[PDB]
């Protein structure tokens, strides 16, 4: 249960940072996931729309 | 010494089986997927299997559907794979590929491609 | 399904000069499309892929733009090293698989 997933429509680069203990500007600022994280990461184009 | 060198190529009959085995050298081979591709002699490439980098996934493609099994044996770090009712069609290079992406489970992209066996019936 | 259509049948030009060939997709990919390069008896490499993206080990003179279903390749500046076949690329979900162009030949 407790499934919960997100959505943001991110900056190009700045995806491989969000990752379980990883910094950078949006794992500090922005966006923190819980380290040792064990859920699942999935992006994609959108500069189409 | 980033290579893949392929084994197992032979001539067999209609009918028969067959079994192959890729080795893999130079990186750690149970972190990466495994793609092999064949080559049918004076034509294009077409995928034929694939396994994930953990080995709980396979996709085939459609003409060896059922038919082929990919396997990883990380004892020796060596790729293997069985053949099942192999037809004329099969003749090909058979060229075992190293998936491109180091943990992603997309699987569009060969980084790196064995020398390639012959196999024909 | 995905039918890659490529023209032209085949390119013939002198060296040195600009090489465009096109490969119009049967339907929308998004941005998802790579071009592979062989030479006759060659292994094919990867040149571009993503459609716009120089893959690692390409001479900047290779160039490859499009989206949808509009895909072509540029070349600057043909040397021996260059004149090979050409196909064009992607992957599917229905059925799953690849479906290949049928190739383009580049003469002096």
């Known amino acids: 249960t407790n499934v919960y997933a997100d959505s943001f429509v991110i900056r190009g680069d700045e995806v491989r940072q969000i990752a379980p203990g990883q910094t950078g500007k949006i794992a500090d600022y922005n966006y923190k996931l819980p380290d040792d994280f064990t859920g699942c990461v999935i992006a994609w184009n959108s500069n189409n729309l | 010494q980033v290579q893949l060198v392929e084994s197992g190529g032979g001539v067999v009959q209609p009918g028969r089986s067959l079994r192959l085995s890729c080795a893999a050298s130079?990186?750690?081979?149970?972190?990466?997927?495994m793609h092999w591709v064949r080559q049918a002699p004076g034509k294009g490439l077409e995928w034929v299997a694939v396994?994930?980098?953990?080995?709980?996934?396979?996709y085939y493609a459609d003409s060896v559907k059922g038919r082929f099994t990919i396997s990883r044996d990380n004892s020796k770090n060596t790729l293997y794979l069985q053949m099942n009712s192999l037809r004329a069609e099969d003749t090909a290079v058979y060229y075992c590929?190293?998936?491109?992406?180091?943990?992603?489970?997309?699987?569009?992209?060969?980084?790196?491609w064995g020398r390639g066996t012959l196999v024909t019936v | 399904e995905i039918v890659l259509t490529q023209s032209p049948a085949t390119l013939s030009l002198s060296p040195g000069e600009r090489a465009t060939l096109s490969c119009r997709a049967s339907?929308?990919?998004?941005?998802?499309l790579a071009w592979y390069q062989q030479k006759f008896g060659q292994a094919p490499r990867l040149l571009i892929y993503?459609?716009?993206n120089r893959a690692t080990g390409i001479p900047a003179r290779f160039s490859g733009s499009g989206s949808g279903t509009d895909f072509t390749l540029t070349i600057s500046s043909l040397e021996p090293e260059d004149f090979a076949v050409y196909y064009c690329?992607?992957?599917?979900?229905?059925?799953?698989?690849?479906?290949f162009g049928q190739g383009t030949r580049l003469e002096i």
């Open positions: 130079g990186f750690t081979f149970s972190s990466y997927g």
């Open positions: 396994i994930w980098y953990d080995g709980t996934n396979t």
């Open positions: 993503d459609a716009s």
């Open positions: 690329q992607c992957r599917s979900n229905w059925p799953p698989g690849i479906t």
């Open positions: 339907q929308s990919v998004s941005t998802y």
């Open positions: 590929a190293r998936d491109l992406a180091y943990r992603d489970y997309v699987w569009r992209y060969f980084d790196l």
